[PDB]
Design a protein around this ligand. Structure first.
Ligand SMILES: [Zn+2]
Ligand SMILES: [Zn+2]
Ligand SMILES: [Zn+2]
Ligand SMILES: [Zn+2]
Lengths: 163, 166
């Protein structure tokens, strides 16, 4: 029976904190929780359990309520002052080779269509589409391009809105 | 500072259990308590404090509840087969020299009356009177006398009856 992150036999003399979920025990030192602090918590959830929980959270089927959130985030990007180049599909007149270089184009108008028809089933998929907009930009344009830089800024804004 | 019986600096990585009475912290193993056992208890009294509580039982004030117990203990003694010689005060006619040799006579009837009079305030005082009965008998009679043996038997019965009194 190996307990804790350190995977060691139980030592009757050491201080441990239990995780109800997985029923494992952790040396307060291994998870960095002082005994005084341990008393301040009612239901401790170990790191592994918390990680798995979050991983499962972002993959959970989206609910109508969840969509209120996706709509908000999408609208915030569309309203961003520097988001004008991604509101609609790239126009060849501005970049003749674009659609030959970018195999999976994406834009905010298309994401809006997909949001409306509830095309996304998990938060991960919605995030994938948005990331695609930024990745395509950084891929097509050189790093010293204002557009490449804009993609950088907008993605950080996106990550913040998601938090 | 220094904690536990082992008098050592507090170690954040060690399991400790605290005493409700003295508020000192002790390594579980040092006081004979496993963690699994610790979780099953609300309160905890360390060995030292328990030792003090055990000792002070005879010194604390006697409560109404304790007095019930005094009556119970006394009744068990009065009903004991070996208590026949201590149920009442010695009659001078049966032993002319008795009250001249025994300085502090005592008997179960007198003790029953003292309980009725609420004369005792500490268990130790009740035990002292009981002990007069036995010591007096063993002083006045030879060891091979049935009287002496009755005292020996009743005193060991009494000592047992006293366990867990309060
Ligand atoms: Zn560990
Ligand atoms: Zn866990
Ligand atoms: Zn104590
Ligand atoms: Zn110790």
């Amino acid at each position: 029976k190996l307990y804790c992150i350190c995977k060691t036999p139980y030592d009757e003399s050491k201080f441990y904190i239990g995780c109800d979920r997985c029923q494992n025990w952790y040396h307060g030192r291994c998870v960095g929780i002082l005994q005084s602090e341990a008393e301040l918590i009612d239901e401790y959830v170990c790191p592994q359990c918390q990680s798995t929980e979050d991983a499962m959270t972002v993959l959970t089927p989206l609910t109508e309520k969840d969509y209120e959130g996706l709509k908000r985030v999408l609208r915030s990007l569309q309203a961003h002052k520097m988001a004008w180049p991604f509101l609609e599909p790239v126009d060849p007149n501005d970049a003749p080779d674009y659609y030959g270089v970018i195999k999976e184009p994406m834009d905010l108008a298309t994401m809006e269509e997909r949001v409306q028809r509830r095309y996304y089933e998990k938060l991960t998929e919605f995030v994938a589409d948005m990331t695609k907009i930024f990745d395509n930009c950084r891929y097509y344009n050189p790093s010293d391009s204002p557009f490449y830089q804009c993609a950088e800024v907008l993605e950080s804004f996106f990550v913040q809105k998601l938090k």
